[PDB]
Amino acid sequence: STAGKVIKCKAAVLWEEKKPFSIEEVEVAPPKAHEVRIKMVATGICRSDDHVVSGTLVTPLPVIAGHEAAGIVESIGEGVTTVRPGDKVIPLFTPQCGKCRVCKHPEGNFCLKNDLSMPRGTMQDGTSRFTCRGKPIHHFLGTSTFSQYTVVDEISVAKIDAASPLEKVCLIGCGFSTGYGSAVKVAKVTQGSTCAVFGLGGVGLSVIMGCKAAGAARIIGVDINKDKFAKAKEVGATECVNPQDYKKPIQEVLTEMSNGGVDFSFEVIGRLDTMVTALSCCQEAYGVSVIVGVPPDSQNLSMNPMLLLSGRTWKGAIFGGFKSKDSVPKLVADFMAKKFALDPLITHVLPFEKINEGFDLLRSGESIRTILTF
Amino acid sequence: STAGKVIKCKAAVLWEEKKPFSIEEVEVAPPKAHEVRIKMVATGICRSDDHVVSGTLVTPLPVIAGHEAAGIVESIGEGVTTVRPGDKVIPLFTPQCGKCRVCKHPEGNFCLKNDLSMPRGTMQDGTSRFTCRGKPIHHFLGTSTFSQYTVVDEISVAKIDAASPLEKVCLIGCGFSTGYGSAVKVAKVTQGSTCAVFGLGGVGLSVIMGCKAAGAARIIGVDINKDKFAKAKEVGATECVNPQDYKKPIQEVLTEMSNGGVDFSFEVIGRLDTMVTALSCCQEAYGVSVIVGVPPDSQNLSMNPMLLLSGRTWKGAIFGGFKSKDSVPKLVADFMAKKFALDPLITHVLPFEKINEGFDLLRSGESIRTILTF
Ligand SMILES: NC(=O)C1=CN([C@@H]2O[C@H](COP(=O)(O)OP(=O)(O)OC[C@H]3O[C@@H](n4cnc5c(N)ncnc54)[C@H](O)[C@@H]3O)[C@@H](O)[C@H]2O)C=CC1
Ligand SMILES: NC(=O)C1=CN([C@@H]2O[C@H](COP(=O)(O)OP(=O)(O)OC[C@H]3O[C@@H](n4cnc5c(N)ncnc54)[C@H](O)[C@@H]3O)[C@@H](O)[C@H]2O)C=CC1
Ligand SMILES: CCCCC[C@@H](C)NC=O
Ligand SMILES: CCCCC[C@@H](C)NC=O
Ligand SMILES: [Zn+2]
Ligand SMILES: [Zn+2]
Ligand SMILES: [Zn+2]
Ligand SMILES: [Zn+2]
């Protein structure tokens, strides 16, 4: 019944950096050609949403953030062919247009239609579907899921299993898939290897799940918050280390523990120093290090290229390297088939209107994923 | 006739940085257990030997440099099994002990017995076989080929085909195998791909040959010395660009030329800035960039890790990733079967006594490889 009509609903608007989200009445326009309007069912609080608040990630403000979510299609614009009203869907913060050089490449997934490289904070057409008191509100990564309703381009949404539990599978929209894919697809962790995972939040735990799935023999978790260690061990870490406990640099500790360096390391925090530490702690001749964390905007790291000349491989990836529209439905199918677990990531569940309590929990160190429900 | 005796012969000794080599009489001790004394036949002048002179590459002085060579075994120490007197051999500046974790790894080649990471400038037993003016003289990478005779450890020498032409195959001891393998083994260049090669000296020309062997569709040579272009095209470059001809930075030029970035880029110069530029010019989502050049000692580069987060792979390698003792004889066999060419790399041939002229030719931009004959 709301098809073709403006919807008035509640959304969490970020008006300014370093402020709480503000629950506002917003107007959500109907979808234009090749756009899809979605009724939100669940959305995760990812550290990347916090990065918009802290200014770590720069994107036009004011904004509706949120990018890790699942919902049900309320209506479709003209020409939409991949979803229908009533379908369960996951919004895709990395699009899959299927036509650019990256979408056509066997390995690439950073589709050229992304809104990450030079953020505009709009729909593909350069405009917004959100207004608050006659003021346009920016979109975030073409998703914007901190809202009862959002509108996304068709290349930024995937249809998923009609029977999937949205309060869990929303994590496949970012944290799980990023961490799991970073291990299994980007690093290509091998059976019997030794892995080191820096940062034991939702994404790092998912990296551990991937390392375990790949048959790593040793998975060393690294975090300065020792409260994160229990859960890391539950999901597959064989040992955990807190750099604050040592009188020497943790790259040295890890090199000693691993008898000369690890096979695979992962930076899942977002600090320049831990990116270089994670590179250094992998074995100098054949080690691989994968950057997953998002560091502060426009800041460069410093490193000695001899670390690479000896034979190391350094790479990064977005969304675990998964081509998003192809992979998300398959990952949901795999979850339904009990191929991996999502409950270990979910520590808190709150109604959407308690979003700020959810961010308080993340910032305090107490939560992994808070899921916000509608 | 010389077996078991100290040999008096000529060598090019480097007494101090930034000075000419001194051609003088040295005493070369007989080989101890598991060592091999070699009569040198031919040695190339590689930019890395010049880096020892300039202090770009730090190794203990005084030293007998030279590492790209071929010769004939004069005698063997007790317990040597892999070569015999009279055998043609290539010294291996990257050893292959066969026993360490790197030698046993399918991908690694930077054997832990190397003298590169923490240079001692000795034999494996921590002593020197060279005396000059009554003083011990350091070895260089366990090779030291700027001498009529040298002594190497058995893990640092490979027996090659008895019919091979030593005045050519000395290049397999460094510059050819390094560039070729950087393409075919390290980057794993694919059929139909676009490559960019920064630096068109002997090693860069060998990278081109590797890209051609791999079936690259486009191979773009980059050099600030336009005199290098003609040879680069002869060996497979489809285009050459001089950064000095353009107003925009060359990574921008190359990104444009390649319709969004190259599949594979190679830094084959040894500058921090071109390492970052070569990384930047590979396609952001699936590009691969290989560092081959040796930069100034102890200096760090600065880069934005967003270059990696979008999906790029950055790696480096020593000696083209080849396990040295396994690979060198096979490379010689392939050369004898004309699977690749060495003549295009050889622009000058001089007697050993004219070593300083050979270094002048390199420094002036005139030569690719000068081969010194004994
Ligand atoms: N590449 C991609 O596509 C994606 C990147 N991200 C990024 O991944 C990172 C992790 O995200 P979440 O798991 O949601 O964050 P989180 O904040 O829950 O986890 C980070 C963990 O790092 C630990 N930590 C902080 N400083 C540390 C230090 N100096 N040493 C060791 N541990 C330290 C914290 O105690 C925390 O447990 C963030 O930067 C986020 O923006 C997340 C999803 C997608
Ligand atoms: N990784 C490894 O195992 C090895 C590394 N090396 C290193 O590879 C590098 C190349 O060796 P060669 O080919 O013997 O040296 P080379 O000196 O003959 O060639 C370097 C080329 O770079 C060009 N060049 C200089 N500045 C440039 C700039 N700003 N932009 C573009 N081109 C520029 C020069 O004109 C020259 O043609 C050296 O640093 C050497 O030490 C060599 C062999 C083994
Ligand atoms: C790991 C750095 C490799 C550099 C090897 C050079 C010095 N060898 C011969 O040119
Ligand atoms: C290339 C950097 C990728 C970062 C992607 C983040 C912002 N998205 C989800 O958390
Ligand atoms: Zn996220
Ligand atoms: Zn695309
Ligand atoms: Zn070894
Ligand atoms: Zn060399």
Going along chain A from its start, the domains and CATH numbers come out as 1-178+318-374 (3.90.180.10), 179-317 (3.40.50.720)
Quick one: CA torsion of B142, B145, B151, B153, rounded to 10 degrees? 30
Q: Assess whether B348 carries a catalytic annotation.
A: no
A88 CA to centre of own chain: 19
Element (H, E) at A48: helix A47-54
Q: What is the CA radius of gyration of chain A?
A: 20
Chain A residues with CB inside 8 Å of B272's CB? 305
**Distance, CA of B231 to CA of A103 (rounded, Å):** 37
Q: Which tokens belong to A229?
A: 């260690």
CB within 8 Å: A300 and B300 = no
**Residue A268 CB less than 6 A away from ligand 4:** no
A161 CA to centre of own chain: 21
Atom nearest to B200 CA in ligand 2: 37
Q: Assess whether B174 carries a catalytic annotation.
A: yes
Residue of chain A whose Cα is closest to the Cα of B262:
A101
**Distance, CA of A214 to CA of A203 (rounded, Å):** 17
Residue among B117, B203, B227, B272 whose CB has most ligand 2 atoms within 8 A, to mutate:
B203
DSSP single-letter state for residue A184: I
Distance from the first to the final alpha carbon of chain B: 19
Cβ-contact B236, B258 below 8 angstroms: no
Cβ-contact A196, A281 below 8 angstroms: yes
The three-class DSSP label of residue A49 is helix
Q: Assess whether A138 carries a catalytic annotation.
A: no
CA distances from A267 to A51, A243, A301, B297 (A): 16, 14, 14, 27
Chain A residues with CB inside 8 Å of B105's CB? 285-286
Is A359 marked within a binding site?
no
Which residue numbers of B have CB closer than 8 Å to A's CBs?
Answer: 101-102, 105, 107-110, 112, 117, 259-260, 272, 275, 283-286, 291, 294-295, 298-305, 307-318, 321
Element (H, E) at A315: strand A313-316
3-state helix/strand/coil string of B330-345: HHHHHHHCCCCCCHHH
B155 alpha carbon – ligand 2 mean position (Å): 27
For residue B75, give the amino acid letter. Answer: S
Residues in chain A: 374
Residue of B109, B286, B303 lying closest to A102 (CB–CB): B286
Is B100 marked within a binding site?
yes
Q: What is the resolution of this structure in A?
A: 1.6
DSSP single-letter state for residue A262: B
**Distance, CA of B287 to CA of B298 (rounded, Å):** 27
For residue B56, give the amino acid letter. Answer: T
For residue B236, give the amino acid letter. Answer: G
Residue of A101, A286, A308 lying closest to B291 (CB–CB): A308
A366 CA to centre of own chain: 19
Q: Which of B48, B128, B182, B289 is catalytic?
A: B48
Give the closest residue (by CA) to ligand 3 atom 9.
B48
Q: Mark B46-62 as b/e (b = at least 16 C-beta within 10 Å).
A: bbbbebbbeebbebebb
The three-class DSSP label of residue A337 is coil
**Distance, CA of B305 to CA of A301 (rounded, Å):** 7
Is A48 marked within a binding site?
yes
Nearest of A45, A299, A319 to residue A184 by alpha carbon: A319
Residues in chain B: 374
Give the closest residue (by CA) to ligand 3 atom 3.
B318
Residue of chain A whose Cα is closest to the Cα of B185:
A311
Is B4 marked within a binding site?
no
CB within 8 Å: B272 and A305 = yes
The three-class DSSP label of residue A259 is coil
Chain A residues with CB inside 8 Å of B304's CB? 298-301
The three-class DSSP label of residue A250 is helix
Residue of B298, B310, B316 lying closest to A318 (CB–CB): B310
For residue A272, give every residue at least 6 positions away whose Cβ sits within 8 Å of its Cβ, in sequence order, or none: A295, A296, A299, A300, A301, A302, B305
Q: Which of A51, A138, A195, A281 is catalytic?
A: A51
Interior angle at CA B104, CA B102 and CA B105, nearest 5: 65
Is B97 marked within a binding site?
yes
The three-class DSSP label of residue A134 is coil
- Chain A contact probe: residue of B96, B103, B112, B286 with most A CBs at under 10 A: B286
- Chain B contact probe: residue of A314, A319, A323 with most B CBs at under 10 A: A314
Cβ-contact B53, B20 below 8 angstroms: no
Residue among B309, B312, B313 whose CB has most ligand 4 atoms within 8 A, to mutate:
B309
Q: Assess whether A46 carries a catalytic annotation.
A: yes
3-state helix/strand/coil string of chain B: CCCCCCEEEEEEEECCCCCCCEEEEEEECCCCCCEEEEEEEEEECCHHHHHHHHCCCCCCCCECCCCCEEEEEEEECCCCCCCCCCCEEEECCCCCCCCCCCCCCCCCCCCCCCCCCCCCCCCCCCCCCEEECCEEEECCCCCCCCECEEEEEHHHEEECCCCCCHHHHHHHHCHHHHHHHHHHHHHCCCCCCEEEEECCCHHHHHHHHHHHHCCCCEEEEECCCHHHHHHHHHCCCCEEECHHHCCCCHHHHHHHHCCCCECEEEECCCCHHHHHHHHHHECCCCCEEEECCCCCCCCCEEECCHHHHCCCEEEECCHHHCCHHHHHHHHHHHHHCCCCCCHHHEEEEEEHHHHHHHHHHHHCCCCCEEEEEC
Q: Which of A128, A147, A174, A280 is catalytic?
A: A174
DSSP single-letter state for residue A214: T
For tokens 């420094």, the residue is B363
CA distances from B95 to B114, B123, B144 (A): 6, 12, 14
Q: Assess whether A348 carries a catalytic annotation.
A: no
Ion ligand 7 neighbours, Cβ < 5 Å: B 97, 100, 103, 111
CA distances from A354 to A51, A262, A301, A359, B295 (A): 19, 41, 37, 9, 54
Interior angle at CA A267, CA A264 and CA A272, nearest 5: 130
DSSP single-letter state for residue A57: S
Chain B residues with CB inside 8 Å of A304's CB? 298-301
| Helix axes of A250-257 and A272-281: crossing angle, nearest 10 degrees | 20
Q: Which of B174, B195, B240, B282 is catalytic?
A: B174
**Distance, CA of B155 to CA of B92 (rounded, Å):** 8
Torsion sign (Cα): B162, B164, B165, B166: negative
Nearest of B298, B197, B273 to residue A307 by alpha carbon: B298
**Distance, CA of A36 to CA of A78 (rounded, Å):** 9
Nearest of B260, B303, B267, B253 to residue B285 by alpha carbon: B260
**Distance, CA of B290 to CA of B197 (rounded, Å):** 10
A170 alpha carbon – ligand 5 mean position (Å): 11
Gap from A7 CA to chain B (nearest CA, Å): 35
For residue B205, give the amino acid letter. Answer: L
For residue A1, give every residue at least 6 positions away whose Cβ sits within 8 Å of its Cβ, in sequence order, or none: none
Give the closest residue (by CA) to ligand 4 atom 6.
A48
Chain A residues with CB inside 8 Å of B107's CB? 286, 311
Cβ-contact A100, A111 below 8 angstroms: yes
Q: Mark A303-319 as b/e (b = at least 16 C-beta within 10 Å).
A: bbbbbbbbbbbbbbbbb
**Distance, CA of A121 to CA of A13 (rounded, Å):** 13
**Distance, CA of A234 to CA of A249 (rounded, Å):** 26
**Distance, CA of A173 to CA of A37 (rounded, Å):** 17
CB within 8 Å: B259 and A101 = yes
For residue A279, give every residue at least 6 positions away whose Cβ sits within 8 Å of its Cβ, in sequence order, or none: A265, A289, A303, A307, A312, A314
**Distance, CA of A329 to CA of A72 (rounded, Å):** 14
Residues with CB under 6 A from ligand 3: A 309-310; B 46, 48, 57, 67, 93, 116, 174, 294, 318
A294 alpha carbon – ligand 4 mean position (Å): 7
Which residue numbers of A have CB closer than 8 Å to B's CBs?
Answer: 101-102, 105, 107-110, 112, 117, 259-260, 272, 275, 283-286, 291, 294-295, 298-305, 307-318, 321
Residue of chain A whose Cα is closest to the Cα of B298:
A304
| Helix axes of B355-363 and B47-54: crossing angle, nearest 10 degrees | 90
Residues closing a segment before a gap in chain B (C–N exceeding 2.5 Å):
none
**Distance, CA of A70 to CA of A171 (rounded, Å):** 8
A71 exposure class (CB count in 10 Å sphere: 0-12, 13-18, 19+): buried
| Helix axes of B250-257 and B272-281: crossing angle, nearest 10 degrees | 20
Query: Helix %, strand %, coil % for chain A, to 5?
Result: 30, 25, 45
